[PDB]
Ligand binder design. Structure first.
Ligand SMILES: C=C[C@@H](NC(=O)[C@H](CS)NC(=O)CCC[C@H](N)C(=O)O)C(=O)O
Ligand SMILES: [Fe+2]
Length: 329
């Protein structure tokens, strides 16, 4: 058998309030989890995840092949040269099971200065027809702001955990410029399930997505109650138990960079499971020009031998590298 990963459930509700003592105790829990397996569940997070799941299901199960082409990213539809990130990511029956829809900051409007400049990683979201998907765009945009709010609170916890003032990360995480994304991923039940859509790890484990580190500062993830994720530890790969009432939180490689690897980006992978399920990450990305000066909370003077890296650089190149390593999703 595979052992269960330590993934503590942390009540993050104090991070929304003004009790500094209570916030420090939450920060300690985040520090402990970040130094151990690198995963925890945020509970008492205030988001209606059942409604998120229901609205997402309604979308995934009603969108048509025609709409998918019309919303497709550039990788699937050469007509859509502006859609590197945002849009529909198609399945390929017989070959690729997963499909998804990605959207970015709703404030990336046609008049936004980064959209006008055509700065990489900024795009105007594409949406299905309102009549075909009533309420979906409005729900999805509001969800962006709900999970943005949770993420801001979590970032206060991480900052305090690292010995910083609570706005150390959050001051770079702003509604007008965040590069954060939501992805609404459908992993289908299929009978028969295409073997071409299944990868095998060195240890024989059947996978839907190979080992990787996240391209994010942190990742704030809702999933169904179907166990699938594994994290690599010193004791080997361990199963992360599902909890469809919580958000699974981990650091990405930008956090590892900033902290000189004190908070590592945990290596994880996705087991193949023949089950209809949802994976709904929010990738907490900063602004394109955000630069956090790296430091080391294990060294007396906090100094680092890493160089500052702008977030936009990190993200554009990180997303391309992840596609190269683990395939176009
Ligand atoms: C987080 C869970 C999910 N994995 C993923 O979403 C995988 C590895 S984290 N991530 C990606 O492909 C990066 C998508 C980035 C997104 N298009 C954007 O432009 O910002 C899975 O369930 O497979
Ligand atoms: Fe991941």
């Amino acid at each position: 058998s595979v052992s269960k990963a330590n993934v503590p459930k942390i009540d993050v509700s104090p991070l929304f309030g003004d009790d500094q003592a209570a916030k420090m105790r939450v920060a300690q829990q985040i520090d402990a989890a970040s130094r151990d397996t690198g995963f925890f569940y945020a509970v008492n997070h205030g988001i209606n995840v059942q409604r998120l799941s229901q609205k997402t299901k309604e979308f995934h199960m009603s969108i048509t092949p025609e709409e998918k082409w019309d919303l497709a990213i550039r990788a699937y539809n050469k007509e859509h040269q502006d859609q590197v990130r945002a849009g529909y990511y198609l399945s390929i029956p017989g070959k690729k099971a997963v499909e998804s829809f990605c959207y970015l900051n709703p404030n990336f409007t046609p008049d936004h200065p980064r959209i006008q400049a055509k700065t990489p990683t900024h795009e105007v979201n594409v949406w299905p027809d309102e009549t075909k998907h009533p309420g979906f765009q409005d729900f999805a945009e509001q969800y962006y702001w709900d999970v943005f709010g949770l993420s801001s609170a979590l970032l206060k916890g991480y900052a305090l955990a690292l010995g910083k003032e609570e706005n150390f990360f959050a001051r770079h995480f702003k509604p007008d410029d965040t590069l954060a994304s939501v992805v609404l991923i459908r992993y289908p039940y299929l009978d028969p399930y295409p073997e071409a859509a299944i990868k095998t790890a060195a240890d024989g484990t059947k996978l839907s997505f190979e080992w990787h580190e996240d391209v994010s500062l942190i990742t704030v993830l809702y999933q169904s109650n179907v166990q699938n994720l594994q994290v690599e530890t010193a004791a080997g790969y361990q199963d992360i138990e599902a909890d469809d009432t919580g958000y699974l939180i981990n650091c990405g490689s930008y956090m590892a960079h900033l902290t000189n690897n004190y908070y590592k980006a945990p290596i994880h992978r996705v087991k193949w499971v023949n089950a209809e399920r949802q994976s709904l990450p929010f990738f907490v990305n900063l602004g394109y020009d955000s630069v956090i000066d790296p430091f080391d909370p294990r060294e007396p003077n906090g100094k680092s031998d890493r160089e500052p890296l702008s977030y936009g650089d990190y993200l554009q190149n990180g997303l391309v590298s992840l596609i190269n390593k683990n395939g176009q999703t």
